[PDB]
Amino acid sequence: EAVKTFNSELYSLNDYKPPISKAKMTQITKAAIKAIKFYKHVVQSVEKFIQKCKPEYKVPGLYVIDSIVRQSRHQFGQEKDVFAPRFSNNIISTFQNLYRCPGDDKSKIVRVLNLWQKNNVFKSEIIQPLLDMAAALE
């Protein structure tokens, strides 16, 4: 039911034209965090959404990852956060999916990556390949 509520709110993105509201992102994030016992399901659901969604929703999907990881690090501590480490497992493939976004959304992904790097959200060995993927597209 925790996973059901999260999935419901995540897929509700399909009802809206991006950019997505702060309030909606907050709702999704709060549901993810409440469901921390099921963090593996939460990550799986986010990744599935990003794999399968329309191009206009790739950036919104990335923003869901960013929002969850940022709130989790804030709420539980950077060292104790379980979401960034779990998202890291498939992250190369997740980003391959994300970069299938409209060309005018590509700069938005790079922005997120640059901020993750600045804040050491992921190790360089993860961030650099993701940055390299954006550059190889140009």
Binding site: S21, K22, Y63, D66, R70, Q71, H74, L115
Partner: peptide, 8 residues
């Protein structure tokens, strides 16, 4: 009103 990748 749109989400931005900012600190919570």
């Amino acid at each position: 009103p749109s989400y931005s990748p900012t600190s919570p």
